[PDB]
Design a protein around this ligand. Structure first.
Ligand SMILES: [Mg+2]
Length: 157
């Protein structure tokens, strides 16, 4: 059992009896001078949810938002969720003591959402993998979906 965490039964390895295995990604890039962002939750082949986010949204914030959405949609179910964000992983797994100086709203929302799934593992996966393994395909799908959502919104459709 992890220590100095927020949800005592949270693990970082896949649970055998998971209902859902999902992949999250937050995308942030510069376009026409401003920072743009998107977030997504996917399986290897399906987009469960993807949205463009407000201008100025950092990649870190987008990653928190994507992970939060996965937790919300998995309320009452057993979830393995993969993120390639070290920031989102650490925010979910390690409790901090001080006032949150950045992303305070998104951190609070994530911490609340941790408690929604019946059982939960938040797992790190490498990003930009070339394989056709489940993790490679899932992470790729989430990255593509988040970037597509962000691009479509900036271009207006
Ligand atoms: Mg990512």
């Amino acid at each position: 059992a992890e220590t100095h965490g927020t949800r005592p039964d949270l693990t970082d390895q896949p649970i055998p009896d998971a209902d859902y295995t999902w992949y999250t990604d937050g995308s942030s890039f510069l376009q026409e001078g401003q920072r743009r962002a998107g977030a997504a939750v996917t399986t290897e082949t399906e987009v469960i949810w993807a949205r463009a986010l407000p201008a100025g949204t950092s990649a870190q914030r987008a990653e928190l938002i994507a992970l939060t959405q996965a937790l919300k949609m998995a309320e009452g179910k057993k979830l393995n969720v993969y993120t390639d964000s070290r920031y989102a992983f650490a925010t979910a797994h390690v409790h901090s003591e001080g006032r949150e100086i950045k992303n305070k709203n998104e951190i609070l929302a994530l911490l609340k959402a941790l408690f929604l799934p019946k059982r939960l593992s938040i797992i790190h996966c490498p990003g930009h993998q070339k394989g056709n393994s489940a993790e490679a395909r899932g992470n790729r799908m989430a990255d593509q979906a988040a970037r597509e959502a962000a691009m479509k919104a900036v271009l207006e459709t």
